[PDB]
Amino acid sequence: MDTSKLKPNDPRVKYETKQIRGKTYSYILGEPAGPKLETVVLVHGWPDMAFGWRHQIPYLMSLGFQVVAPNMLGYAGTDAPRDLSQFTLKSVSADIAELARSFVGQDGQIVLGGHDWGGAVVWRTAYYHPELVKAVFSVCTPLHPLSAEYKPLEDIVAAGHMLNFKYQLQLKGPDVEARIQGKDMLRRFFRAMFGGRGPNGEAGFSTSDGVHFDVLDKIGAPPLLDEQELEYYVEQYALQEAPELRGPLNWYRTRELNAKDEMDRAKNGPPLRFEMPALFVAASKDNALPPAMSKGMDAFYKDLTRAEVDATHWALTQAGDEVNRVIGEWLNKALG
Ligand SMILES: O=C(Nc1ccc(OC(F)(F)F)cc1)N1CCC(Cc2cnc3ccccc3c2)CC1
């Protein structure tokens, strides 16, 4: 089988829509070679897309897995409700359960794979729905404990803490949504997000000030995306209603919301415990989420697998041939 990465609107996959929990959920369906072992749900992050697994989906299809990878809430052909409560990691965990059970049955079981914000989803979905996650893994994103207190992110960086998150302030703010609308800003925006730099090495994104709008006129075509996926990321992001990034940025506007759900579970609900197999693929140059943040991840697992790729936050495509190698071998022994 052709195990190369997925090309834009690749014929080796199905582009299907399925209504779940009130919204339309676009997804890609990558189907196995021969009789499937399992079904795998792949979850991207910000500002990624189901297409962000181009190196993984065909590889997992070639391993005999049925692969579904949905565009999440706010991204591409999936709906973006106005309700902030729909972008909480809980409700979206409830989404992934319904989309899974839409494919393997209510008693079925799934190998869950997420990354970035989707990396935080698949742990939540493994926490909320352990009836279903036979094996869960996350790339770049390590487990964060259930939130017990809510602090506005402004107050946390005002005391010098969590400065690696100071970009969500502006992101959650009106700036990125108001300034990046239409194919033209989105295109330059994606040059920025995927490693673009300007004539004097200005970066379109930094973890402290987020999107830099003054550089994005000057920023070149990206090292981690050819022209056709950059134009595929923009053709697909234009699917959302202007301002097209309300949904994609909405994943950052739910700090207090997720707090209320997890303060509930940190006090009443069960503790953060994973008794199903788990892989964690850290990316070395993930300037967004450093591999030190993984820290005391392992004290929450019966059987956790550690891994690390010398790569940026965009580990699915940069280190894709090394990531596919890592997930495959872990999947092979985790399921036996
Ligand atoms: O913003 C994120 N990723 C990202 C950042 C910058 C990017 O631009 C580029 F990297 F390309 F330059 C691209 C993606 N997140 C991904 C992981 C989420 C999981 C999470 C949730 N809550 C937490 C609460 C307390 C402690 C840790 C927590 C971690 C956070 C947001």
Short description:
This protein is α/β, with parallel strands linked by helices. The chain has helices at 57-62, 89-104, 117-128, 153-158, 167-172, 175-179, 182-193, 227-237, 246-250, 255-267, 315-318, 320-334; strands spanning 14-20, 23-30, 39-43, 66-70, 110-115, 133-139, 205-206, 210-211, 278-285, 304-312.
Overview of the structural elements:
The chain is α/β, with parallel strands linked by helices and 336 residues long. It has one domain. 33% of the residues lie in helices and 18% in strands. It is built from 12 helices and 10 strands. Strands 1-2-4-3-5-6-9-10 form an 8-stranded mixed beta sheet, sandwiched between helices. Helix 3 (117-128) links the parallel strand 5 and strand 6 (133-139). The chain starts with 13 loop residues before the first strand and ends with a helix. The ligand O=C(Nc1ccc(OC(F)(F)F)cc1)N1CCC(Cc2cnc3ccccc3c2)CC1 binds next to helix 3.
Number of helices: 12
The count of DSSP E runs of length 2 or more, i.e. the number of strands, is 10
**Series of H and E elements:** EEEHEHEHEHHHHEEHHHEEHH
Strand order of the largest sheet: 1-2-4-3-5-6-9-10
